[PDB]
From TrEMBL, chains A, B:
The lineage of its organism: Bacteria, Bacillati, Bacillota, Bacilli, Bacillales. Zn(2+) 1 binds at D76, H78, H89, H92. The keyword Zinc applies. This is ArsR family transcriptional regulator. PROSITE patterns: HTH_ARSR_2 (PS50987). Pfam families: HTH_5. The keyword Cell division does not apply. Transmembrane segments: none annotated. It comes from Staphylococcus aureus. NCBIfam families: HTH_metalloreg.
Length: 95, 95
């Protein structure tokens, strides 16, 4: 036992609802309000607000203030590319 | 409209108990019986037999029969290397 493994346990633990990935995708490229993103993506603002919280508290996502409304957005392109690589291999080649 | 994503969902979903990673570690080095691993690895074999069950059905691990007892073992060294990279990067390049 130790703190090393315990860490790798936090990452996976951070994960929760699947829909989360959805927002992440749109976030990877784009920027809108807190509700707008919800309404459109046919989502109940009841959860949204709740969601961001966690992740944000996980150090995964980062928020930024500008005038009034807050616009989210990733700061570590690493995960962005990492996810693409995982999806790029989703289906092996052909043989 | 969720044939591609549904996949990435199965992966993360596959995960379950933490002790999992642990066993995987020892399983990614030496191969032993079902108990021995549980005994020496201070673990209630009650879960083991129950553990592999899942993963197996997930296609993550592949069992092997030869003689009598079945010795488990990975097949896609990819995951093994992938994990190493995750922990290898989990390094705070200072600051």
């Amino acid at each position: 036992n130790t703190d090393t493994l315990e860490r790798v346990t936090e990452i996976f633990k951070a994960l929760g609802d699947y829909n989360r990935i959805r927002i992440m995708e749109l976030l990877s490229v784009s920027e809108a309000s807190v509700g707008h993103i919800s309404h459109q993506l046919n989502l109940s603002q009841s959860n949204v607000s709740h969601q961001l919280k966690l992740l944000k508290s996980v150090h995964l996502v980062k928020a930024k203030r500008q005038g009034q409304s807050m616009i989210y957005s990733l700061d570590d392109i690493h995960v962005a590319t990492m996810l693409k690589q995982a999806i790029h291999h989703a289906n092996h080649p052909k043989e």
